[model samples]
Target: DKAPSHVPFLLIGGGTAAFAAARSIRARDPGARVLIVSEDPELPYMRPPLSKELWFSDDPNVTKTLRFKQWNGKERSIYFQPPSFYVSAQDLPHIENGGVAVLTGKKVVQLDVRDNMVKLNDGSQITYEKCLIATGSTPRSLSAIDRAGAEVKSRTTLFRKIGDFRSLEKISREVKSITIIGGGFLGSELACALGRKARALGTEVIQLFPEKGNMGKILPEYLSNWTMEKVRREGVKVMPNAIVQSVGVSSGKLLIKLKDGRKVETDHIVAAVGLEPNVELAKTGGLEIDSDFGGFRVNAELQARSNIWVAGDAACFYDIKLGRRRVEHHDHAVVSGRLAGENMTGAAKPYWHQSMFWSDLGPDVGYEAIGLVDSSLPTVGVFAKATAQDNPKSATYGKGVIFYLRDKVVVGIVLWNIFNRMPIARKIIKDGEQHEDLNEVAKLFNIHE
Candidate 1:
């Protein structure tokens, strides 16, 4: 029998995964005691928008941009619940208020697995019947910039936390030009967002990717090439297949040297290359970790130890479908967190998810991807200009969406400059199907798919 007025589940970390766990715990065990401990002062916040609107030229002085009238904040609200509702594990009465709770500003120093307790930085320890670690990630740093360049307030920044976003928002205003490293979703969206305000603010933004094209590893060449073409048309300079050797701050400007000896001049640099999991605390706690990736190991059920689990960017999940342990995409983070939460009770099921993600690149132009559409796969999709003009460059816009199919099923879709047809791509993929005719897909998007 459950204890009255108290549910007992303690979740570590204050990111998306932990929030999902709280929701899951409630679904299975009503009023189940759930306590969350996070190092951040604020409760969990949404990260996807970090690359988009969060960096908008905020003139904290101006009200026009702060409103963000076009997009309803409701959808974004999904990332963050009310701050008043979150609770911590240390309070007995609060834990009894139980149901579930979250704690902010508490840093987990270590985990005592044998005793099933977590040591916090505040000189206190709490025992848990079950636990979840969703520590998430930190942005990967750039040795090129740190070692060689002079550290300045405006010289470099990475987008990982809310504070990081604030820093970039400040620096982007001071600089005249910027070079964003890593052409993945983060880099692409930032480039596009900044580009939209370029003329108005008289700023120039460029995107640099290690690969020769956009989504090279995750997207096929036909699609990557087409996507890069659109990016170029939108006024973002893309240097394909290029690597930065080092960044040296000189003459009050940023000098970037390429691996092949090309140099770029800019005022600031934004590194979106990747993220490193926050594993130091977990590793010290004696949790079994995958050395190759420095993340805690988890079972297919997403459990790390008895009544203990890990998920999201922090957990090195052994994907049965991918046949390897890896930090999965955002979709994986949300779905896995939810699954792990449910499994905490008796309805434990294997965490099997169809990985899907998308990005916004100005107006109706968007990119959506699904599944594991690697480079080796022969990818096929329709790339059509926004309009049927005699000159291709003059076409309405480089509007297009492509599907990457594997084993005759829709594994992924990328749509740009074309919005209507995007949904069809999802429908085709869900059924392990595709549209053979190029015109058919396009017609669905009110263009060609």
Candidate 2:
């Protein structure tokens, strides 16, 4: 495909960031010559469902078979928005109809920052006055898996894109046992979803995490253990402080050897370890990256340089309330994308939106949290009535509030099973509300329990 000689604005990815930026840019400058290039051929879609909603089927007939079906009993789609949202009726980017273009299956290989041009894999130069690098992140795989042999590596998969979810859905039906690595938000939820479904199919499931507690990096110790116990109760063998040293085939069976001198055999291994920021393109361009997280460094305005910007997981921007942060969730992507888009149109605006992220445990349990949510900080939790009375000694699941503080000032808030109170939580954090007692925080949230 031939590359355009010039573009007024260029977007380097096709996820939430690209879509939001396109919308914002079009809204601000309708006649702007915008071009969006992505390696993935698909249009922008929400990713949270890949781990949460898309796995389960509402229809009882499909649930037992693990075949996901929509309300109309057809194959469920993972897209949060339809193609019409991005393209016009004539099969072009809505902006393309108004001088915008979207190119897929094309990669940006090199950047000439001095010339304001990006070299593509196809040996085409896409010159732009302004560009946004929203390349996002990639899933990290263990080195040992690669060294083990192709057969062992073939047994492993990473859960990130829509393809992974759909492939796992088919794999889930045939596998007798599956092992999940990592106990973070994605790993934990996948463990519960796949473990429960595997159990129904008479399959065994095991979950391994290197931390002392599951989700130890985010949730406090009390709540972390509480969540692990809940997951274990659902029949997943939760192995905290366990690490896979290597994986290999022994006697036609896949064997996972642990660093702790233990071995387990499984039909397949799902690596939900975490994601590494996609910063290669930014690095090649000599862009400043955040020292803490290795994401493209942007100012409060989401600008990396005079005519360059970044957003989504790849952008590490200053948070007015939380200092410097590189958020990798959906909310952060949308808000940052919009801000970057607006800024690209010559607006010297500062990004101040405090984005929130949510995680799901199962069909019924979920949590929404904002701010730092660091487990190391001091914490105060308020449990629901039945939870307080029943599990007085441990954290409960139904509904609760967990607050993280640094030097007595509220830095993070996690609401378990508590919905529609993000505004209040954000207000408390924005206001720098602090308290020594759990009751004080509870009163602030207006929850009696």
Candidate 3:
């Protein structure tokens, strides 16, 4: 009925950033009590795998139990920490030997920054010594489907968290077809993962997008078209150049109609177009929201106010090279949260480290990238051979590197089928040097290997 009135360290969101900040804070201040407040019923878990490995798992009970074996045969749970690692919220005040506590299934409705207090939806308020707002982003939904009524919406899933994954997984097994709307990173990744699963089950899967190919907005058309071929190879039907006009229920099935007169009657639909940051709470806290990017405006140190900080998808931080930008990636969340934690403990460090993000279109088509990787930028691709991906049946993308350039400087790098080259790629972008030996740069990634 009530919460502790005060906490030493409080984190407003129980996502990846909160997890990293807790770990970082514990690393610096050994005996400081930390509490994490979350709206999710479950503890913070690694979210990246939700769109990839978790769906690819072979365990029949995986969707139910959420425990899986990796390719290396090591078992893992999706949670960030075991249940025992956390103490009860009531025990937090009395505990001396520092511990992390999670208050789940609750929403913080107000942030009275002037009083260093946050009011939860349950009519309880918490004052804190220091606090971090890690309120992450939510999956962007399609209004056509959302306004499609309860029957059509019930048959659809907006994939983001574990609840979304569990719902989709359950429905996927029971449904004959699942139509995923959108061509962004998460949509494409889920299409590949679910396609592979549905193929063996004889279920129909379609990756519908508004572009020529998968990930058409980020990766270049050459690479995106190459990826579309690979996705088809994985047994998915590619529905490109799709403009979803509206969705409605027809004869007990969800029917989606395109603006061009195309219709798809699907048993289920998964909307994974993009994400909008959870800045409503930040707005309540009286923080400025970035109009260009949907997040709270923060400095390079990720501070909204002297004692208030923001991180992860909710933070619009200044990039040394790209001006102000907000990265909704896992690596950025981890690094930024760690920096915030250190600063909270008086480390006083700027968020200098360049963050990188990765996406997997099956293991063969996976790539790790950094910096401004927009497809609109002048791009270069250095594949193993000129005819590397001409044949659709090629074993892989053939181990290549795609460089995104601005003003002849390599502003972004993608290691396609490459491994362990983030350090070098990051340095290249950090130094901002133009390379004439782009061929030798291929050797640095050891692309052939």
Candidate 4:
């Protein structure tokens, strides 16, 4: 007797990547049978707002939703799907039956591309003609720091998930001070948010990091220095070139142990060190992996193996815009997921876009990065001192921009006051053209070129 043949249009994550890909596929192929396998019990939510200025909103009634309109009340509410119109009329059914089969709470334990199927941790199997892997990344646990076993005083925090935000909020309700670890985007954003909330709630905030600049590799040092000044002016105590050797929980206080045996006491400790791609299942299943950057290798088309595709945070996507390849930001995930969805449906596509990223820390300080600024390139920046208007929350601090240059051609731009100059800078990067006077672009935003 021959084995049974079961195939479905499958997506392997429940986050923004998988959900958006599924939606794109459904729009293109309405009649196709599509199924999603994910570990999260809830449907995908917008992940970026968890760190940006949105997290600092004063409205306590607002919820963290996936739809922008619903999340911010910008327009009429939009949902993932539609149910009956008369059933309580609560914007009605979010998921339409017979459109996409979302297998929530199902962990994909193993994947066999050669067999054209994947096995869930529950012992069930999903056979697919084509599939997408949007398995996102998880917070990277620092083993070296953990091994030090230093004494941490109390209330350790990490702001990666909804739970993390809630935990910090709870800590804010009771704690007097917070010590934020790491100087990356996540760390800085959290410190900024906490600073705003702490001011209103009467909590003290401190920032600790070994690096002299925030996001040193991605932005020019001058821009970073400007950002550091802004951060320091906001009452965030910053420690540069000091490595945290250990964090211990003891005596009803959080203690930060340094390599020199110094201890810093605070009510809370927040770690935003970075993230590691969630590939335990894939690695255990004998899939091809890229160990250098700690992600699974995929082509520009996002092919992992025959009939296997990975997108979003889990895959090491090739960056054509930067002349290199690496796992990167939220935009990469969104675009990569869409492209992977298209490719799975028989249209081969290339993932190419100008590398861009932005962070909002209480409106006064806004940082936008336009390209991949490696260590070798020289960085040029124009910064205006932060005014009362620079705060997005406080309506102070105008836009600032950081431009990355290599051999005179514009390579990247990090913007502060000139939100409009992004496209101009991006075009320069794309065209690899040089403007003898950047003032042409800078003048438009009231800055010296």
Per lDDT, the best of the predicted structures is 3
TM-score comparison, 3 vs 4, better candidate: 3
Whole-structure CA lDDT of model 4: 0.65
**Per-structure clash totals for the candidates:** 12, 1, 0, 34
How high is each candidate's TM-score? 0.82, 0.89, 0.95, 0.84
lDDT of 2 by residue, 184-275 (tens): 99999998888778776668888998887779898888778888998887779889989888888987788988999988888888998889
Which number leads on TM-score? 3
| Native-referenced Cα lDDT, model 2 | 0.78
How would you order the candidates by lDDT, starting with the best?
3, 2, 1, 4
For all candidates in order, the CA lDDT equals: 0.68, 0.78, 0.84, 0.65
User: Which sequence of candidate numbers ranks them by TM-score, best first?
Assistant: 3, 2, 4, 1
Q: lDDT tens digits, residues 1-449, model 4?
A: 11113445678877767866877776677655567776766555556666653555556633443323322234321234433211111111232333565666778788776777778777777678888888888776555345634444224555666567667766766878888888887888777767777776566888877777776556566666766777766667777666887666668767677776667778877878888787776765567677677677787778887777788888876665555355557766766777787887777777766646667665545655667555347766565654554443442234565567777877767677444355666776788767777766566455652
Stretches of model 4 off by over 4 angstroms after superposition: 1-7, 62-98, 148-155, 260-262, 284-286, 374-376, 383-399, 406-408, 434-446
Position 21, candidate 3: lDDT = 97
Model 1 lDDT vs. the true structure?
Answer: 0.68
